[PDB]
Amino acid sequence: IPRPVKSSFREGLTVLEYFINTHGARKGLADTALRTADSGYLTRRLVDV
């Protein structure tokens, strides 16, 4: 996002900067959740082989 956020968490974010941060936060959380299953399947296949 080319804006970008220009406030630290000590100064306190504005409304739009926080709303922009929420994108990446939720994306990372969901990506981690799917990465667990990916790692599990890789482990199972390598164990079988």
Place this chain on the structure above:
DNA sequence: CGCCGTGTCCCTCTCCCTATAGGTTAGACTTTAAGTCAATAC
């Protein structure tokens, strides 16, 4: 005229009432194993 590669698509796997005939059980009668007492001997 006669056969072979490439492409697309489909599919699969993963994360009512009546009438007859026959079998079943429940219920009571007489018999039997069972619980009981009284006298006795060592």
